[PDB]
Amino acid sequence: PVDVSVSIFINKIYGVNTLEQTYKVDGYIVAQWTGKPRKTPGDKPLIVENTQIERWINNGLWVPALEFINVVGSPDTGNKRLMLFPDGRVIYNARFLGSFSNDMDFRLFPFDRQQFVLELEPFSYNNQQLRFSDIQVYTENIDNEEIDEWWIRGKASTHISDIRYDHLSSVQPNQNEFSRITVRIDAVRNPSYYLWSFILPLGLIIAASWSVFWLESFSERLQTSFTLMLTVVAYAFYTSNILPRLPYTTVIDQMIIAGYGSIFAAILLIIFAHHRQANGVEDDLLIQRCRLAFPLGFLAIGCVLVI
Amino acid sequence: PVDVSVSIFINKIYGVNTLEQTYKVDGYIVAQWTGKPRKTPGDKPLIVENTQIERWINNGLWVPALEFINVVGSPDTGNKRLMLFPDGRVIYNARFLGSFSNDMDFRLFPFDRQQFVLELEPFSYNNQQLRFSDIQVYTENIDNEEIDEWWIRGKASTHISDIRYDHLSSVQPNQNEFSRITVRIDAVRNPSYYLWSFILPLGLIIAASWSVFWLESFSERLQTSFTLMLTVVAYAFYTSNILPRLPYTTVIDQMIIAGYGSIFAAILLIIFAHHRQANGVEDDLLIQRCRLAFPLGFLAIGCVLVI
Amino acid sequence: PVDVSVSIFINKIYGVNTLEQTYKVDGYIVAQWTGKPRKTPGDKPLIVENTQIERWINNGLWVPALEFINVVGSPDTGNKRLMLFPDGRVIYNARFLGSFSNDMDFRLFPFDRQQFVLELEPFSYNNQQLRFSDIQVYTENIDNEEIDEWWIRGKASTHISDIRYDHLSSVQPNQNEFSRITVRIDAVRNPSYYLWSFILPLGLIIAASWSVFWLESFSERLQTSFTLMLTVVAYAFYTSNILPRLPYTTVIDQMIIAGYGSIFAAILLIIFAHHRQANGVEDDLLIQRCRLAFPLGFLAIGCVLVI
Amino acid sequence: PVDVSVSIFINKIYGVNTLEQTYKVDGYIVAQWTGKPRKTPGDKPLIVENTQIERWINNGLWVPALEFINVVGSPDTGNKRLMLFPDGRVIYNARFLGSFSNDMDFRLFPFDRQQFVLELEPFSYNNQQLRFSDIQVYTENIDNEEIDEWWIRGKASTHISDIRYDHLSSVQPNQNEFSRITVRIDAVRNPSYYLWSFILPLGLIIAASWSVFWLESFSERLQTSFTLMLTVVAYAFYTSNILPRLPYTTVIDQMIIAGYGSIFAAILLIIFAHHRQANGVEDDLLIQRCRLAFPLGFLAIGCVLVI
Amino acid sequence: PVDVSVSIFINKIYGVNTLEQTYKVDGYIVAQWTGKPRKTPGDKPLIVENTQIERWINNGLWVPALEFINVVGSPDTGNKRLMLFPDGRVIYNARFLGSFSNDMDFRLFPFDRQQFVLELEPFSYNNQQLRFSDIQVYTENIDNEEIDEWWIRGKASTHISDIRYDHLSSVQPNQNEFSRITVRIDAVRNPSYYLWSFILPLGLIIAASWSVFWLESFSERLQTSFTLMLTVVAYAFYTSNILPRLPYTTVIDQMIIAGYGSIFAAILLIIFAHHRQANGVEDDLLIQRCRLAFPLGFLAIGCVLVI
């Protein structure tokens, strides 16, 4: 059972695809195991770069393929390197840039909490053939959080485990529990842009919506909300065009519907005040003057939308 | 006639292109057949990964090319693996991510029922040369439906069949019935986002559109519906920018046309009310009070879209 | 002069690029020619798939490169196959997906008539060396016309010709008339979508534009025409953002100009009526009642533009 | 010093990238030079296609690499062909699609004059080793300019020159004047689409903007210009979203700014007219009748833009 | 420790990705070192182009892989060349196009000062094996600044240094200090487009926003600011649709927020004017006359952003 030691170096995690639930990761893989002692030129370890690695394999060098389980497509592999030591040991070092998959929940945008995951597992060798001895991940990140889209929080989380597959080859003794490495990097979204450029003005839009009750005439009260209605649509447009596409409603999407709700509610109330009367122009002096009622009733509905 | 057993493992179905009628599928293919017994090291199966497979083929290993009939372009092949057994049997395992084609009807969007199809067929070997014995498809997906865009319903539809080509090679006896595996996975679109962020507020727009008749003056009644027209255009725009591009009208597209219609009808009625008179400002108390006539008359247009 | 038989199988024509005058074609090419008889294992036809073809070419197998004259870039080749018959004949079969170029006029969009073209020609062997004997094209298409963007007219038109190049190598006898196969597929755009979702609502806009004349006051008449102006711009935006990009104006584009024209023309009349007087407020009783003049005057200008 | 004759065939120039100053060219390069006499099969010239050229190079065929100096990235090479003559001469033929760079000034859009340039130069061989004897360029183009985006003007300008590099290897005699072929093709933009769908309606907007002075009331005069301002915003949006992205202002971009100014200037006067009084509402009968002042002052300021 | 001299030629820096913090660089690398003296054909230096370089590596030619540290993905390599001199020395010349990463601060857009960086490091050989002797970078650029998006300032900054890695093999002597070349190119953004087409009219919107106080009636004063609000919304959209996406607010983003604030302040003031009274109709003749108060009160808040 060959013991394989892994070391992952993470350079950059970028380009999150919200729709595809995807993120790109650039870095290096280092895999080490001990083989049969070799005769190296001179006696210091022998270096075999890119092209030449295949040539060594053709001569029977065992270099096991390690698969990125949760990779989308196949990674762009940069430089490959084999370091052959005379005492037997082998070090496979290669740089990669890959597109990775993971379950991502974006409901509480733009205050989402995400975790970037890497899953490594031998493609052909089961737990009894190839075994992951240990793994350390180096997240060589730091500083300038206010410049980056994501703020990495913890340090790299690591777990070597054994994955059992129920439907495999015509093999029955016990060859089915491949050993799998799982790396986890926690991150939080930089909410600064969405607060100041979306939440804030949306708030002012919704706030200024309530100012329709301070209008004197009914004709004024009603027609203005059509302009106000037209505003929320215009804002829904600007929102939807810039925010990331998802198959569900976010906090902001809820806020927009709530905006649509306030205006349509105002429309009903304004009409109600005017034509529900006991003479003709009896605009319910108090209901037309609900100028504080549903702004704070909106603060009640606002606190429940979070609940 | 070589009997081949196939097993498909579906990891991810994502990235639907509505216009090209395209969807992406990531997974593994496993194909197995029994060859002439080989003498493997020890007696345990011999493993051959990626690069080395080609070399073995040059030495006379028969590894049949299985074509994905309904693939767009050529799929990204990840790791390749040949498992050679001493008793003869051969197992081909490879990871793939491909863009596949299938007829997709998006008329009743966002309430689609779609089906993702895979069609496997040997590229050069007919039914009498190579025949598909059986296939099981493993959709190891489950849970968290409200996070994913599509909801997979059944397990997997499977069908091995024989395709006759009328125009083929220089063969006339019977080399023309290639065997095809056809895998079908049914899915329904997650309508949650589109209902709350598109359907609902559109309804309120159309709803509030009719409130233009509760205006007192003729000028108020008329001028306001222009703002209302401008509202539907703005909403039609917001719709088009976000929704999937199609070469036909959807339910949503139809609602928008209906929006244009309701406003245009009111325009006609409002002008009519004022100018259908025996003096000049005889605004027909019944027609200016079509405040219940065509709002629920629109519910007839709504039931006709359902019929 | 080697006689070559060609068969093109068209699977899907999609992805028309309006600006580049380009369309994507997925399908198979089959080329057959008769060489000197071979000794195949047994006597059974020999099959050579992908990788192995190059090995045969290195050993002196003549497989002429057949170039797609009008392809942009180089096509995505799927599976390749050499079928070598013992009587001599050789069959090259390969799947391809390519982006093809052709002159495309989109002026009378969305009512275009286009034709999808393929041009095959030997890359290195002239007519006296290699000549295209015959070609059949199989467009295994039919049905689902109102689900698809294009309606195919013919089945497939073909023309084998000899292309004379006037400026080539320092060769003078007669080596310059390469034989070319040209396949043509006629198609018509399904204008239904653009009619209901673009032509129609634009029409309602222009129509309701004319309703500016049923307004009483001058201030109403003029101020309303500014909201009307803003609506057409809103529509111009919505149109261009969704419709295909071209280097010229379409039928839809002209309607938009016509909308702008009607309103600016209306602006001129409305101002004219008020200030062209014999007192100050003598609004010309007939010119203010141009409520029918240019609605049918636009239908006159509209019907003349069709000429 | 090997005399090399080159012939460039241009099939298609498309896909201008305004920001990157890039354009795509599809075509063929043909290179001919005379080597030491060969003994060819039969005695007529030998043809070598794609794959086989590398094999010939491995056995000592000198095929010099010709670099596209102004290519961005590395070109899509189609078919390669070596034609080996017994009298010595060798003819290299290959099809290419490449993205080329050139300084492109788009200031006077959509009335650009552009020139598409190709620069060819040997990668490793200087003027005394390899020299370009002559070059002819064939633009096999013609007809239907009103169908294409760019109108090719000239035929093709040609220039073989000697390029001196001052910093190369530690080499000193005179090995620094690589011979370079420079192909230039002039073209003019088809302004039809931009004129009718952008210049004109923008023009009508700016013109009709001035109709703000024929309004009676101050409130009307002022409030209308807010709708007028909102229109230019809408138009700026529609323009910029469709127009090519640039790092400078175009003619059309200038038109838009001119619109903002016309409207803001109107706002200032309208406020000015009103509060510059001998009572409160004494609007200077001539300043309210600046209905002719700055419309023709706009044509005076407009012609200065030509200066 | 092999002394390697490097020379980078920068052709084009283009395509900045604001979110990914990425820029594309086209150019050449030249690497020179002295090997063991060779016997070259004739006696003049031997040239080895593209394909043949691998062949030399197989026969034992040491050609060290020099890795681009801050490269995203793997660069597109154009022509490769090995120049082998008889005295021993070897020169590697290769053209490259790569996407590079660097910390990029875009806060003060469109007035960014950016620096484009290249980082070279040997992939497999440490400081005691391979040492960077010296490096010169040639940015053969100059002139035509008003045409390009970025204005290159310096002549290019250099830093040859030694990077220590702390976590590698079970190696203890001193092999962990790879030598790294870092090239820096300073650049400034061409702000012209964003000033005239974004900064300028946005200011006019804000300026004209204040003109709401020159309105006489209360309803006019209040209702007009809703058109004004909708305009800033309209403008926020146009800004966002054209300007580059970032995870933080820029000056322009701030200008828009300043607008939303200015208008909301007016809404509150206008409402305040109307209802804070000692009679009923005391619309503060003085506070409605803040027509100069917060135009300069906005200039007080505005000048604070410079400090």
The amino acid present at A80, given as its one-letter code, is K
Tell me the shortest Cα–Cα distance from A15 to chain E, in angstroms: 7
Inter-axis angle of helices D218-242 and C218-242, to 10 degrees? 10
The Cα–Cα gap between B243 and B109 comes to 10
CA separation for the pair E199, D294 (Å, rounded): 25
Q: Is E7 within 8 Å of D167 (Cβ atoms)?
A: yes
Cβ–Cβ under 8 Å, residues B181 and B132: yes
Pinpoint the residues of chain B covered by CATH 1.20.58.390.
Answer: 191-307
Give the CATH class of D191-307: mainly alpha
| Best mutation target, C54, C124, C172, to test chain D (most D CBs within 10 A) | C124
Question: Angle, to 10 degrees, between the axis of helix A251-275 and the axis of helix A218-242?
Answer: 170
Q: What's the DSSP call for residue E147? A: G
Q: How far apart are CA D56 and CA E299, in angstroms?
A: 76
Going by C-alpha positions, the residue among A141, A138, A148, A160 that lies closest to residue A29 is A138
Give D47's strand partners: D83
Contact D95, D65 (CB under 8 A): no
- Calpha distance B3→A302 (Å, rounded): 65
Spatial distance between the Cα atoms of E16 and E112, rounded to a whole number of angstroms: 12
- The pair of structure tokens assigned to D252 is 């059309």
Q: Coil, helix or strand for D202?
A: helix
Distances C28 to C56, C75, C138, C152 between C-alpha atoms, Å: 21, 12, 10, 19
Q: How many separate helices (H) and strands (E) can be counted in chain A?
A: 6, 11
Residue B25: partners with Cβ closer than 8 Å, 6 or more residues away: B10, B12, B13, B96, B97, B98, B100, B116, B118
Q: How far, in Å, are C274, D25, E21 from residue D132 at the CA level?
A: 77, 22, 42
Burial E160-173 (b: 16+ CB within 10 A, else e): eeeeeeeeebeeee
The bridge status of strand C2-17 relative to strand C22-34 is antiparallel
DSSP letter assigned to residue E199: I
DSSP conformation letters of E85-140: -TTSEEEEEEEEEEEEE-----TTTTS-EEEEEEEEEESS--TTTEEEEEEEEE--
Nearest CB partner across the interface for E242, out of D64, D67, D240? D240
Question: Least CB-CB distance to D234: which of E76, E228, E234?
Answer: E234
Q: How many CB atoms lie within 10 A of CB E120?
A: 23
Q: Phi/psi at A188 (nearest 5 deg)?
A: -125, 140
Separation in Å, CA of D95 to nearest CA in chain E: 17
Q: What's at C291, amino acid-wise?
A: R
The experimental method behind these coordinates is X-ray
Q: Tell me the C-alpha distance between B81 and A123, whole Å.
A: 8
Residue B290 neighbours by CB under 8 Å, 6+ apart: B213, B269
Give a three-class secondary structure readout of D236-254: HHHHHHHCCCCCCCCHHHH
Q: What is the DSSP string of C245-283?
A: P-SS--HHHHHHHHHHHHHHHHHHHHHHHHHSSSSS---
Find the farthest-apart pair of alpha carbons in chain D and give their distance in angstroms, rounded.
109
Radius of gyration for the alpha carbons in chain E, expressed in angstroms and rounded: 31
H/E element, D157 = strand D157-164
Confirm if B195 and A191 have CB atoms less than 8 A apart: no
Q: Which of D230, D240, D267 has its CB closest to that of E227?
A: D230
**A10 and A139 Cβ atoms separated by less than 8 Å:** yes
Q: Which residues of C touch D45 (CB under 8 A)?
A: 171
Tokens of A17: 């695809």
DSSP C224: H
Handedness of CA A6, A7, A11, A12 (dihedral sign): positive
| SS3 at position D136 | strand
Q: Which two tokens stand for residue B27?
A: 């997974």
Handedness of CA B241, B244, B246, B248 (dihedral sign): negative
In terms of Cα–Cα distance, which of E12, A41, A240, C204 is closest to B229?
C204
- Token pair recorded at residue E170: 């079970």
Q: Are B79 and A123 in contact (CB under 8 A)?
A: yes
Element (H, E) at E193: helix E192-194
Closest CA to C3 of C125, C183, C112, C164: C125
Which residue, E264, E263, E287, E262, is CA-closest to E274? E287
The Cβ-side half-sphere exposure at C165, using a 13 Å CA radius, reads 19
How many contiguous H segments (helices) and E segments (strands) does chain C have?
6, 11
To one decimal place, what's the resolution in Å?
A: 3.9
What lies within 8 Å, CB to CB, of B4 at 6+ separation is: B31, B32, B33, B64, B122, B130, B131, B132, B133
Please answer whether residues E124 and A81 qualify as being in contact, where contact means their C-beta atoms are separated by less than 8 angstroms: yes
Interface test with A, best of E101, E164, E220, E226 (most A CBs within 10 A): E226
d(CA B80, CA B51): 8
Tokens of A282: 């009896």
Taking alpha carbons only, the member of E148, E179, D47 closest to residue C126 is D47
Q: Read off the amino acid at residue D8.
A: I
Instruction: Pinpoint the alpha helices (H) of B23-69.
Output: 50-58
Q: Residue C232 and residue C238: Cα distance in Å, rounded?
A: 10
Is the sign of the CA dihedral B261, B267, B270, B274 positive or negative? negative
Q: Coil, helix or strand for C200?
A: helix
| In contact, E88 and E37? CB cutoff 8 Å | yes
Taking the CA atoms of D54, D60, D66 and D71 in sequence, report the sign of the dihedral they define. Answer: positive
- B264 CB neighbours in chain C (<8 A) are 204, 207-208
Q: Are B117 and B184 in contact (CB under 8 A)?
A: yes
Buried b (16+ CB within 10 A) or exposed e, D3-26: ebbbbbbbbbbbbbbeebbbbbbb
3-state secondary structure of C80: strand
Which of E76, E230, E245 best probes binding to A when mutated, by most A CB atoms within 10 angstroms?
E230
After which residues is the backbone of chain B broken at C–N > 2.5 Å? none
Minimal CA–CA distance to B221: which of B260, B270, B294? B270
d(CA A119, CA A103): 13
For residue D25, the surrounding DSSP H or E stretch is: strand D22-34
Residues of D in contact with E191 (CB under 8 A): none
C-alpha distances out from residue E82 to A214, D174, E52, E78, Å: 81, 20, 9, 14
Burial of B178 (0-12, 13-18, 19+ CB in 10 A): buried
The enclosing H or E element of A105 equals none
Identify the burial level of E22 via C-beta atoms within 10 angstroms of its C-beta, where 0-12 means exposed, 13-18 middle and 19 or more buried: buried
CB B120 within 8 A of CB B180: yes
Q: Residue E187, CB half-sphere, CA atoms under 13 Å: how many? A: 27
Contacts of D211 in chain C (CB under 8 A): 222, 267, 271
Q: Which chain A residues are within 8 Å of B216, Cβ to Cβ?
A: 218-219
Among D124, D219, D253, whose Cβ lies nearest the Cβ of E81? D124
HSE-CB for B7 with a 13 A CA cutoff? 14
**SS3 track for C149-184:** CEEECCCCEEEEEECCCCCCCCCCCCCCCCEEEEEE
Q: At a CB cut-off of 8 Å and minimum separation 6, what does D179 contact?
A: D121, D122, D127, D130, D131, D132, D160, D161, D162, D163
C-alpha to C-alpha distances, D243 to A144, B274, E149, nearest whole angstrom:
36, 45, 17
DSSP 8-state secondary structure symbol assigned to residue B123: S
- The H helix count followed by the E strand count for chain B is 6, 11
Compute CA distances A184 → C211, D9, E50, whole Å. 64, 55, 42
Please give the Cα distance from D28 to E94 (Å, whole number): 24
DSSP B96-122: EEEEEE-----TTTTS-EEEEEEEEEE
Encoded amino acid at C41, one letter: P
List strand residue ranges (DSSP E) for chain A, in order. Answer: 2-17, 22-34, 46-49, 66-68, 76-84, 89-101, 113-122, 130-139, 150-152, 157-162, 179-189
Whole-angstrom CA distances from A106 to A19, A237, A252, C51, C261 are: 10, 20, 12, 45, 47
Q: Which of C81, C133, C139 is closest to B169 using CA atoms?
A: C81
Length of chain E: 307
Residue D307 CB coordination number (10 Å): 4
**How close C268 gets to chain D, by Cα (Å)?**
9
A25 closest CA partner among A132, A244, A184, A179: A184
8 Å CB contact of D215 and C223: yes
Contacts of E163 (CB under 8 A, 6+ apart): E121, E177, E178, E179, E180
Helix-, strand-, coil-residue percentages of chain C, each rounded to 5: 30, 30, 35
User: Rounded to 5 degrees, what angle do the CA atoms C271, C275, C280 make?
Assistant: 145
Contacts for E281-286: CB closer than 8 Å, 24+ residues apart: E283/E218
Interface test with chain C among D134, D231, D232, by most C beta carbons within 10 Å? D231
> Of the candidates A12, A14, A208, which has its C-beta nearest E229's C-beta?
A208
Q: Residue C78 has which token pair?
A: 């799927």
Residues of chain C with CATH 2.70.170.10: 1-190
D1-190 domain in CATH 2.70.170.10?
Answer: yes
Residue with tokens 């927009």: A256
